[model samples]
Target: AVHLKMMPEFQKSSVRIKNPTRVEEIICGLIKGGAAKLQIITDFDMTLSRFSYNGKRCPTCHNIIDNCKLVTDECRRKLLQLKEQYYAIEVDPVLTVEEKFPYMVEWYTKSHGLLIEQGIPKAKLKEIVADSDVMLKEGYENFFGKLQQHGIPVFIFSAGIGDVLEEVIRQAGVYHSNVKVVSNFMDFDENGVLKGFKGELIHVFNKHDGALKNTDYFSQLKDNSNIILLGDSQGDLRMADGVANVEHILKIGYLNDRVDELLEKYMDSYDIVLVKEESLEVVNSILQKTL
Candidate 1:
């Protein structure tokens, strides 16, 4: 058994398990079950990926496409304009998520349509990912490595572009065999040029629908009952909704923006809330004990 004091990684202020005893109990269960019964359900954007690096904001999966060289300067300007307008609606305190749904769909559709017009090519994606200002969260190597080593199932559920998100992790050398991605994958034309996205659009507010749709994946993992979920948005709390039979689940949220206003709500929902954290060290520490 690992004592809290022996785990320096959990000592960081970013490590927040609201109920210490409950977290310990969950961790103990995870440890007892070991690697075979363990699994992970996590959000990609700003969850596995960095929210900011070197005091400069890092791009999300959508932002990668918007700022890539493949996108024209005019298109970039328009994308920025859309972000300015819709981002406000996304974070507005007064509006309900239900009220924000249609707008989110519109925003994604418009932005994706613009990118398709730019004729983004699959061949250029590697360069785009390499050149873009995107980064994985700190300690991601250990997080992915340990899980892969133990053969633990890792489900990356995101509303972001699946192609871009996969590319980022692949480049980082962490897109291992144990990982599964559920996101809005790009639908390329016969010539491998971006034409549109496949399936129902997955916006932030529609995660419940997306999770329920992935019954096949979750169903196969019925034995992996313990889950450690990580996300940055309140909507991300639903990422684990499709789990077949959960035994002990831990929710860790990252409060990156609107900290003062949203902290209480996050604290209320998430078992652990990490405010503006840029690393996965705390998660890695817990995994060191649990796995």
Candidate 2:
């Protein structure tokens, strides 16, 4: 038996595994397959990115745009108002996901409408992202570069803005060939200002729909079945549903908010949960073993 107790990373205070023996068995399979059969399916915001820094919450890809200089201070206030109202619904305990689904859609739709009205130039995205407070999780270089070095594929499935999320990774100098991103891309007009979003809207509740939409991406990778999936939201668990096949997968969830309220659900869903922690050392350790 592969002993997780002997693994120092697993012994960390932040790491919680409800099924240690099962996790050990999965790690055993991960090690057995090595890098050859591995692929990563992860959420962009607060998964690959950091949830907070220095006691303040970090911006998501959407937050990067929402808080950027392109937006008016008044507009920002309105956006915050929308979040304050809808975000409560997003995390509410009483409502079922089925009930909260349309509200999430409504929230994204209204926010996008407001953003398009700002007439943000396409050219400003780079500067906007550069000036934003977005930060990737610690050890991101190893996490991204190592995968590129080994020719491992990474699918970044985000409900955040695609253009913004891409620029964030690009500016970080880790947007390698092995990485593929799918998100809500901005549609600009002839003058190069935002008009609307292209393709389907991807909100928190509709990831299962998004997964099924990307059959081609997963279909081509039939042999690469071992997955290391990461996310900060419950919707993130559905990210790997479209994978062509599954031999073994390790779901790592980052529980960055409402710790007491969501802990049980996250623990039940994710193979490993990192609570209120902002580092990827545990994952890096697993990669160090597998790769």
Candidate 3:
């Protein structure tokens, strides 16, 4: 039997895994790969950002933009309604992925439309992100800095607004060259006002489509066979679907809400599941040993 006490982070009360032996074996592979064969694929929202701070809910990449002072109160209200209605289906226990696909598409489509109508200026995104209530997880500097120092490829796969997501990291001072972001980028008119989102739609459950679309990026990293994937949603598990050669991959999930209802599913699918955890300590510890 593997000793859970072998590592302090593994002993954390919030960390849970369905199979300790399997996790140990994967970690062994990661240690062997070191930083050479390693690459990271992570979701941008609740996975990398704090879900809540001081008992108050934190905003996702989209929410940061939605709740910004630039948006009108009426628009924000409609966006919140869309989130409430669609989010229920998004996390419902009984609905399968296929069953929930259209609704996800509908939610993003409508929300993006509303945002575009708000005439958000491209020039103001930086200021908006800086002033908004968005926050990265604790230890984010270490996580990003360590990977950047190692020259490892860090792919941020998000379904949120790309321009806003990039600005958030840009202002954070860690949008290193080693990092790449793929999300729904906005198409601005000549005046730099929002017009429409570019490329295919990426919603909560449509990551498979997004993954396959980003094959060109992954094809260049054929040598990077070991992956560390982080996500807060089940769809995030498919973020690495485009990677052609994967020898070892560790899937880490953050169960930020509905812990009791989603714990079993998250534990079964993710190699490591952090329950209501607000820190990146566990992942940082793993990287410390591997890198």
**Residue by residue across 1-291, what tens digits does model 3's lDDT show?**
234568888888899989988898888888898998999999999988899999899998888878888889999999989989998998776988899998888999999999888889998988888889888999999999989999999999999889988998988999999999999999999999999999898887888888888888899999899999999998899999899898999999999988888898899999999998888888898888889
lDDT of 1 by residue, 203-274 (tens): 989899999999999999999999999999999998888889999898999999888898888888898789
* Superposed model 3: Cα runs more than 4 Å off: 1-4
Clashing pairs in 2: none
Please, what are the lDDT tens digits per residue for candidate 2 over residues 9-42? 7888988889999999998999899988999999
Give the least accurate 10-residue stretch of model 1, judged by summed lDDT.
Answer: 1-10
Would you list the clashing residue pairs of candidate 1? none
Task: Provide the global lDDT of candidate 1 against the true structure.
Answer: 0.90
Evaluation by TM-score, superior candidate among 2 and 3: 2
Q: TM-score of predicted model 1?
A: 0.96
Error of 2 at 10 (Å): 1.4
Model 1 regions lying over 4 Å from their true place: 1-6
* TM-score, structure 3 vs. true: 0.97
Best by lDDT: 2
The lDDT of each candidate is 0.90, 0.91, 0.90
